[PDB]
Amino acid sequence: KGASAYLNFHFPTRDGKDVRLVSLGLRADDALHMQLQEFLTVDDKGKPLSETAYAERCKKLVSRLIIKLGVTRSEEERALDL
């Protein structure tokens, strides 16, 4: 029951449209998520952002993202040295 907000990461595709790479559900119990939600909705005066200010802030987020490729351990490597 009820709705929630999502942070979606889109990337341009060869057909000139885009594709949604990953989605992040912003849980109300997560102070990071709510800081993100507030940042992308409200202008630190209560006032909902103009689409311009929203698009600017989305861009500003992007500009500070860091992308890292990570490989997890295999079960063989993670097994306890027993």
Add this chain to the structure above:
Amino acid sequence: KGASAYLNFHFPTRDGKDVRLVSLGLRADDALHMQLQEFLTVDDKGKPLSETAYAERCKKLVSRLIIKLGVTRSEEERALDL
């Protein structure tokens, strides 16, 4: 059993470190994921990337990301008009 690759999105935090916002598991059955994996590992000659080339490509990804905030429908709104 076995390992897998992940695409991690980090963001800088007020303590001057960072936090991992979202992680994307790159499934071997997903041609998008494998195109991403190849892009971040290999230099279209077979040759594994230098850390420099890797960091450059990570940045290039970031530069073309589009972030959108999306709200899903509540159960009340999504209910069938029955």
